[PDB]
Design a protein around this ligand. Structure first.
Ligand SMILES: [Ca+2]
Ligand SMILES: [Ca+2]
Ligand code: NA
Ligand code: NA
Length: 481
């Protein structure tokens, strides 16, 4: 009954075109270990074969047309992806497609465009007179032609770009007659501009087309939902309308989670309010608390984990996570949760009652960057925690955040899941004990640490309490033998 998401990629995976086939082959393992949905990387053609997918050259080329030096995307062909989805669906695993609609990269040709420079620290401030630039804005899709969509893109579908090809210069340019979209993040004055050619969501043909593409994408891949990329750079009312639109056209629930990247609960709450709470967000503040705890050597106050997070205020709209493709080593938002702490963080997201937790491919299987700081494969340490969630993390919760280091929580179990109930402890410093209440209904049961970190049994007393142990900088999750 508990649902668990997996982000099924990391940044540095090899460009061998076998990822979709790998996903197909992993479907039995995923289903067996309690994964109920996967977020797949962007499935459409990027600026090159080795694009992770955020380039977003051609949204209608799912590895089907010979464009940018390749038919396949990094991850494989359309047919291979459709087969992977078919295998996942046969095991009741839902699939969330990544939606990259902030920008378009890798335009087929430049156009001459009149523009002004803007201050990268305050994009509302103009820093030049008008000048003629060569911007990468013409999309003709020569390998695809009009198959699926005859929509062509031109400079006037965008607000701006970061590159003038004529002078060969990297600045933020705003096109003549354009205005940055609102509402977006107010960072850098207005954070509409991020990268490549920035889509103009004031343009009514653009809003219609991105909506029409959304339905097409959902149909083509039989998606159950979406992950929205870079949403702090995209007109909030448009994202609301897009989600409603696709739900209306498909007639499906289409669970959606947006990546609004800001370590700030208030900003996230503003985004939720302005999108009418129609979709979830990733719990970025919780990720930064995990990173903080993992880097402070026991000095972190573990009590802080209960506050300042999306999951603490809006649990039904929080997708909780430990690390992702932006926070992994070497990447643009690097804030990796250190390996020693990582299982403790997974206990926090997987065994507590609030939030929709997500497991990271890079944590399960390791990351394949070129550094000596890559995340090691932690599958074996995460699996017992996944099993705790799947089989034991049910029923009423009791919190014990009553200590700088050793914090814990229990779950009483639910009569709908036989033998359910658990008692979790984590500590960023010295180990020790904590007595916790697991429910009088569990009186006299013998519980053991499903992680194997502690080998002692705990017998629950008549009053429903057990004396639970945890090792230094460790995690233990006791459940009925
Ligand atoms: Ca934008
Ligand atoms: Ca605009
Ligand atoms: Na824009
Ligand atoms: Na601490």
């Amino acid at each position: 009954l508990n649902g668990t998401l997996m982000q099924y990629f990391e940044w540095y995976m090899p460009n061998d075109g076998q990822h979709w086939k790998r996903l197909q082959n992993d479907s039995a393992y995923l289903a067996e270990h309690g994964i109920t949905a996967v977020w797949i990387p962007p499935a459409y053609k990027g600026t090159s074969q080795d694009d992770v997918g955020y380039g977003a050259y051609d949204l209608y080329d799912l590895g089907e047309f010979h464009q940018k030096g390749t038919v396949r995307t990094k991850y494989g062909t359309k047919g291979e992806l459709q087969s992977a989805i078919n295998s996942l669906h046969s095991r009741d695993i839902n699939v969330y497609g990544d939606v990259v609609i902030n920008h378009k990269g890798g335009a087929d040709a430049t156009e001459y465009v009149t523009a002004v420079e803007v201050d990268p620290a305050d994009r509302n401030r103009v820093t030049s007179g008008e000048q003629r630039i060569k911007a990468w804005t013409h999309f003709q899709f020569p390998g695809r032609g009009s198959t699926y969509s005859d929509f062509k893109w031109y400079w006037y579908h965008f607000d701006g770009t970061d590159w003038d090809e004529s002078r060969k210069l990297n600045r933020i340019y705003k096109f003549q007659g354009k205005a940055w979209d609102w509402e977006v993040s107010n960072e850098n004055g207005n954070y509409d501009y991020l990268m490549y050619a920035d889509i103009d969501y004031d343009h009514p043909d653009v809003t219609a087309e991105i909506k029409r593409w959304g339905t097409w994408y959902a149909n083509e891949l039989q998606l159950d939902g979406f992950r929205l990329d870079a949403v702090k750079h995209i007109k909030f009312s448009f994202l609301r309308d897009w989600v409603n639109h696709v739900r209306e056209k498909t007639g499906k629930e289409m669970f959606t989670v947006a990546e609004y990247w800001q370590n700030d609960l208030g900003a996230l709450e503003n985004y939720l309010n302005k999108t009418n709470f129609n979709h979830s967000v990733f719990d970025v503040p919780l990720h930064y608390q995990f990173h903080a705890a993992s880097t402070q050597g026991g000095g972190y106050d573990m009590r802080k984990l209960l506050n300042g997070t999306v999951v603490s205020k809006h649990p039904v709209k929080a997708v909780t996570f430990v690390d992702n493709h932006d926070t992994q080593p070497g990447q643009s938002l690097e804030s990796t949760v250190q390996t020693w702490f990582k299982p403790l963080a997974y206990a926090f997201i997987l065994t507590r009652e609030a939030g929709y937790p997500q497991i990271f491919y890079g944590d399960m299987y390791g990351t394949k960057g070129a550094s000596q700081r890559e995340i090691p494969a932690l599958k074996h340490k995460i699996e017992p925690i996944l099993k705790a969630r799947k089989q034991y993390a049910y029923g009423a919760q009791h919190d014990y955040f009553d200590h700088h280091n050793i914090v814990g929580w229990t779950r009483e179990g639910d009569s709908s899941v036989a033998n359910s109930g658990l008692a979790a402890l984590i500590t960023d410093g010295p180990g020790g004990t904590k007595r916790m209440y697991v429910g009088r209904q569990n009186a006299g049961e013998t519980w053991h640490d499903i992680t194997g970190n502690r080998s002692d049994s705990v017998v629950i007393n008549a009053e429903g309490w057990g004396e639970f142990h945890v090792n230094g900088g460790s995690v233990s999750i006791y459940v009925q033998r």
